[PDB]
């Protein structure tokens, strides 16, 4: 039903070709095992021939007679074979791809046209709800998914099933035993892969749980960067982050170990089962004599059919995910729930006017629970008059103008145009009788002529002229070049807004509506153009029944009737003089108011250089990958020798040879492969593991030892940084895993394969490499044309999507409705190009895949053709034919593995490129000296002179300009300002988070500019608004080692004693040893702040800094904290910028700072004697 039928809906002849293509997909999938059925037949005759050839040792010429007769007959069959299958798979290939294109093209084109129509046909609803943009984004991504859902993926699916069910048909028919054995290994092969999913899923979460700690540490630290910097607690986080990395690495190595165990055992069970299939298949030959080895290989082709099932699964997932996502939104996509607007029928009034009548209208905006903006309404405006509406709190007038266009059906009551209800008349016609001028004009991107033409489709420039000329818009446009043909470039901001609105007026003037609606058209406009446009409206007024709402009262002066609302509630109505006579609401208002990343630059081989630099030794892993590489072909060689000697060889010695090769196939693979695979996995696993350690170490430390606008004021974010730590190291880990994987298959194919290739007749080599590279290039150029078409398509739909998003983002088109069908018309014309392009790629994708399979039979042809014929002619041998098959499986594991690890190398290279440029850093400040720390350095009297500053957004209106202060030691320096910054920034600059643009700052009179950064941050009293508490023992939180400072119990005791946090410390379990309980979930702001205070006074700073400490707080907490702050200070210098002016009353020096410029300075009573900003601040404190 709705799931499928609609998904596939319409397409009368399309459904038919869909079935023709489907059928061809069936016979395509059917063809492959038949091709392999042929492989057994050619094997059969050739085997019988070989058995007599070695059985001779007497006669020679007879083998030259009969064996060659049979071989010639088989060549005769061969010719009808490659050809017979080839022409078929070629045609049916072009057809099955025609499914991918011809059907999808018309289906998608129909979907697009209906979707694009229905969206505009929903009208009000989109404004009522959902995303209006994010929605049309995802939706077009879903329709993009549909192309993947209804494409040849289905054709491939049926092809696969044809190879599966059709494969097993032949298998079961030619024997039921071997079937049972393979069916027995099916759950077993499914069993080992089951171990995989359990291991992968389990080990991921462990590593995630491990890195979560590393992530959490990275989470808070990077957020607390200004704090850790100020306290210089970097090296401890350094060590912890190394410990957590140590654990995440140990779970990493165990993961790799188990992984290699799984893949290894899986392949063991595969080759073991394969060998068992042969041992019993042979056992059915030597003594039994049932199979000649046809089905023995064919059942392996049944394994290839199961792999076809594995290729089938994605196609279903491609179909299902396309189905499920589409049909569910399809209910929204199609039809027209509508039923408040529509496009059609209704009643057409010829009375061409109607005294507007509003009767008892109760309405609520579709915000649901929001109260009715308009409760009840009564308004009757006689024809030809101009009624003015007014209000205060906003809207409520705008609602009535909105209702007049029937944009919202009123909850209760009715609005009557003429005598009839408004809901009887055709909506489209109503829209045509209603002109609307909004306060904020909008012009579509087109000629002014076209924007007017959007008012009325059928028009001539003469009417355009009369329109603008009556709208007095005919002046600036003539002076303007291109005249009426002048486009409005880059949306609507080009020329004066008054001119824009005036043009909108000309557009509504062409409409010649019998009702005119003006909403604050004059409002939000410069005075001059206001008077001009107003004059235009006036000439547009008096001629049409209209209703005008604005907050401009001069134009209301000449109105025939005025109606007051103030919130939408109707009270007074009538002429201006009558209203002023009432001295009501009208008179009252008139007179009272009188996250993305990754810059482009790459690595360029610096990768393996730095890697090897950080990779001390691993030659056993890669060498083991080499011996495993050369291990792979031996299997292909042994089996080649098995059937080889089985084909050519006599009845004697068959048992010994077959047994020996069977066992050799066993020990060489099952025993050795597991060993070498687990050995390398254990090597490069730990390699990537320790790389994962050292890299993230040398990154995060390079991150913490540099701040300097990467932290203080980055355009980046915490998440982007954590993301960097994850992705970069994970990617280079895959880079090295790919390194060993590639060298492994490299020697596996090139190295051993060349050696095997060398013993051919040398023509066979050339003919073979006249295929493989050619079909490889054909597949590459296929991939290139593929992406080229995908991209050009993306460009076309890009443009159509842009003008579509343009339409849907502008809902004001519905007020005109003229463009409803016109827009879908332009969209139709826009979509017409990809349509023909869809037809174009029908031929293109069709020939590519066809040719790909055209090379398939052609490959098998020349292989067996030349394998027979000329080779058959002189010295026909059992070898060199199966070695071709070996070279084939090497080209398969080559293309397969290389192409699989190719994109892994890409993203890694890019990710590595980022991680390299970041670690180079710009180390700047760490330790050094700059001073010898003389025994005579204390005081704490801080100087500021002519200091200007801006945080690293340069033209951000620097908060400090021409600033100078002074503070004596042992006393409190108060600070107060308007809002925002300059409060906090002074404190920030004292941290030397950023060195100011000009001027200087002193602490002992020495230059902070020239002072060492570390020792400057060695004495600081910094307290933020909402102190961030690290997850750790609260005792360890209280004491942050400044430099050498050990955790001191008696000290932190004194800290709690002073901070009044000792209350919680006395009682409760674990006391000081109590953990923060998952990010301080157990404490309120007051408690955390108490702890922050303890952190401050632990260090015993000669300088304290309070940034809005008490800003967030209440009741007793404010008093106990204020008490703590006061007992914390007065022993040392402190700076308080706090917004509590109630608590500022005790200060040695209070300073009024005006936006970078210190305005007033002095003691409380002195400034109180003065007057200005400060007194206003206290007066507003109340």
């Amino acid at each position, epitope marked *: 039903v709705s799931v499928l039928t609609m998904f596939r809906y319409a397409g009368w002849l399309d459904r038919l070709y869909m079935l023709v293509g489907t059928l061809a997909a069936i016979i395509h999938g059917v063809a492959l095992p038949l091709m392999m059925l042929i492989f057994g037949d050619m094997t059969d005759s050739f085997a019988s021939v070989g058995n007599v050839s070695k059985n001779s040792t007497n006669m020679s010429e007879a083998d030259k007679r009969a064996m060659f007769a049979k071989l010639e007959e088989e060549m005769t069959t061969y010719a009808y074979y490659y050809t017979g299958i080839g022409a078929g798979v070629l045609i049916v290939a072009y057809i099955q791809v025609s499914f991918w294109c011809l059907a999808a093209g018309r289906q998608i084109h129909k979907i697009r046209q209906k979707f694009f129509h229905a969206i505009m046909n929903q009208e009000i609803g989109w404004f009522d709800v959902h995303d209006v943009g994010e929605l049309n984004t995802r939706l077009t991504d879903d329709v993009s998914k549909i192309n993947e859902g209804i494409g040849d993926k289905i054709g491939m699916f049926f092809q696969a099933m044809a190879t599966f069910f059709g494969g097993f048909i032949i298998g079961f028919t030619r024997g039921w035993k071997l079937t049972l054995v393979i069916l027995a290994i099916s759950p077993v092969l499914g069993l080992s892969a089951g171990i995989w999913a359990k291991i992968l899923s389990s080990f991921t979460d462990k590593e995630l749980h491990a890195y979560a700690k590393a992530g959490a540490v990275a989470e808070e630290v990077l957020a607390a960067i200004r704090t850790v910097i100020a306290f210089g607690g970097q090296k401890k986080e350094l060590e912890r982050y190394n410990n957590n990395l140590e654990e995440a690495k140990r779970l990493g190595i165990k993961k790799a170990i188990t992984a290699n165990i799984s893949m290894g055992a899986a392949f063991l069970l595969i080759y073991a089962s394969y060998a068992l299939a042969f041992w019993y298949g042979t056992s059915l030959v030597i003594s039994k004599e049932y199979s000649i080895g046809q089905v023995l290989t064919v059942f392996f082709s049944v394994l290839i059919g199961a792999f076809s099932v594995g290729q089938a699964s994605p196609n279903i997932e491609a179909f299902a995910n396309a189905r499920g996502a589409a049909y569910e939104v399809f209910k929204i996509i199609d039809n027209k729930p509508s039923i408040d607007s529509f496009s059609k029928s209704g009643h057409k009034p010829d009375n061409i006017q109607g005294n507007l009548e509003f009767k008892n209208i109760h309405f609520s905006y579709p915000s649901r629970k929001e109260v009715q903006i308009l409760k009840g309404l009564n308004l009757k405006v006689k024809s030809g008059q101009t009624v003015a509406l007014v209000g205060n709190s906003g809207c409520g007038k705008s609602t009535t103008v909105q209702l007049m266009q029937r944009l919202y059906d009123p909850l209760d009551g009715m609005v009557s145009i003429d005598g009839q209800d408004i809901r009887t008349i055709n909506v489209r016609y109503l829209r045509e009788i209603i002109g609307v001028v909004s306060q904020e004009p909008v012009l579509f991107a087109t000629t002014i002529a076209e924007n007017i033409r959007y008012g009325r489709e059928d028009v001539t420039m003469d009417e355009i002229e009369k329109a603008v000329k009556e709208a007095n818009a005919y002046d600036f446009i003539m002076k303007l070049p291109h005249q009426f043909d002048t486009l409005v470039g880059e949306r609507g901001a080009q020329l004066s807004g008054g001119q824009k609105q005036r043009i909108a007026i000309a557009r509504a003037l062409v409409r010649n509506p019998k009702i005119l609606l003006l909403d604050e058209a*004059t*409002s939000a406009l410069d*005075t*001059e153009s*206001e*008077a001009v446009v107003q004059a235009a409206l006036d000439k547009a007024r008096e001629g049409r029944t209209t209703i005008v709402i604005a*907050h*401009r*009262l*001069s*134009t209301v*002066r000449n109105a025939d009737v005025i109606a007051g609302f103030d919130g939408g509630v109707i009270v007074e109505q009538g002429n201006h003089d009558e209203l*002023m006579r009432e001295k009501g609401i009208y008179f009252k*208002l*008139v*007179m*009272t*108011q*009188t996250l993305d990343e990754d810059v482009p630059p790459a690595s360029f081989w610096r990768i393996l250089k730095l890697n090897s630099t950080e990779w001390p030794y691993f030659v056993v892993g890669i060498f083991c990958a080499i011996i495993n590489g050369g291990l792979q072909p031996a299997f292909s060689v042994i089996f080649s020798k098995v059937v080889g000697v089985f084909t050519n060889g006599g009845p004697p010695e068959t048992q010994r040879q077959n047994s020996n090769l069977f066992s050799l196939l066993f020990l060489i693979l099952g025993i050795i492969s597991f060993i070498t695979f687990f050995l390398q996995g254990f090597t490069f696993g730990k390699a990537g593991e320790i790389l994962t350690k050292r890299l993230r170490y040398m990154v995060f430390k390079s991150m913490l030892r540099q701040d300097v606008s990467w932290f203080d004021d980055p355009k980046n974010t915490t998440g982007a940084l954590t993301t960097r730590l994850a992705n970069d190291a994970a990617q280079v880990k895959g880079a090295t895993g790919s390194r060993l994987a590639v060298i492994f298959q490299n020697i596996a194919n090139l190295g051993t394969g060349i050696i095997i290739s060398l013993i051919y007749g040398w023509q066979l080599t050339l003919l073979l490499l006249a295929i493989v590279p050619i079909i490889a290039i054909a597949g590459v150029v296929e991939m290139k044309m593929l992406s080229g078409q995908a991209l050009k398509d993306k460009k076309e739909l890009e443009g159509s999507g842009k003008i579509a998003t343009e339409a849907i983002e502008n809902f004001r088109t519905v007020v005109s409705l003229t463009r409803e069908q016109k827009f879908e018309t332009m969209y139709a014309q826009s979509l017409q190009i990809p349509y023909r392009n869809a037809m174009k790629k029908a031929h293109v994708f069709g020939i590519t895949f066809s040719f790909t399979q055209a090379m398939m039979y052609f490959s098998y042809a020349a292989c067996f053709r030349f394998g027979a014929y000329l080779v058959t002619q002189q010295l026909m041998t059992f070898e060199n034919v199966l070695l071709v098959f070996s070279a084939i499986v090497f080209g398969a594991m080559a293309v397969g593995q290389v192409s699989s690890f190719a994109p892994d190398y890409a993203k890694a290279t890019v990710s590595a490129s980022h991680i390299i440029r970041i670690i180079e850093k710009t180390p700047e400040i760490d330790s050094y000296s700059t001073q010898g720390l003389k025994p005579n350095m204390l005081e704490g009297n801080v100087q500021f002179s002519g200091v200007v500053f801006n945080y690293p957004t340069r033209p951000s209106i620097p908060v400090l300009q021409g600033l100078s202060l002074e503070v004596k030691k042992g006393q409190t320096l108060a600070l107060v300002g308007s809002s925002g910054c300059g409060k906090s920034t002074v404190v920030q600059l004292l941290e030397r988070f950023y060195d100011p643009m000009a001027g200087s700052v002193f602490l002992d009179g020495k230059e902070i500019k020239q002072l060492n950064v570390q020792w400057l941050r060695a004495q600081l009293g910094i307290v933020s608004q909402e102190p961030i508490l690290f997850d750790c023992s609260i005792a360890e939180n209280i004491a942050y080692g400044d430099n050498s400072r050990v955790v001191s119990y008696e000290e932190i005791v004194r800290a709690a004693k002073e901070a009044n946090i000792h209350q919680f410390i006395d009682s409760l379990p674990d006391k000081y040893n109590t953990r923060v309980g998952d990010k301080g979930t157990q404490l309120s702001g007051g408690q955390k702040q108490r702890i922050a205070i303890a952190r401050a006074l632990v260090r015993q700073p000669h300088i304290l800094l309070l940034d809005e400490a008490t800003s967030a707080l209440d009741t007793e907490s404010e008093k106990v904290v204020q008490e703590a702050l006061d007992k914390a200070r007065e022993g040392r210098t402190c700076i308080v910028i706090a917004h509590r002016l109630s608590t500022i009353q005790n200060a040695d020096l209070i300073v009024v700072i005006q936006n970078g410029k210190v305005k007033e300075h002095g003691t409380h009573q002195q400034l109180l004697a003065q*007057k200005g900003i400060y*007194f*206003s601040m206290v*007066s507003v404190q109340a």
Partner: nanobody
Amino acid sequence: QVQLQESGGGLVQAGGSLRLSCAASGRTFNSAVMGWFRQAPGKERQFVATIDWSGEYTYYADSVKGRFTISRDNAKNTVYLQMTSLKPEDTALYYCAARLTLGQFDYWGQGTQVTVSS
């Protein structure tokens, strides 16, 4: 393009008449009236009086009404408000302001400070 100046703004004791005037020169004709203000530091701004450039009458505040008077140039744009009997409360900065079609004060001038005693 607009600006409003004041003339006569000075000092006087309780019971004195302080006649003021507001000169308005710029561009506007639709309903731009002339209106005066009064504000004190540490407090919001309060209004005074306003004649309508229509031909109706004036609007006096329930603080200053009965006492204060207002006028026009009669050949040109100005407003002469005679301030009769100013209490020490009156003491404030007075800045004349002009109408806006919108009807929310967008026009302002120079102002003048007035000090009253006993």
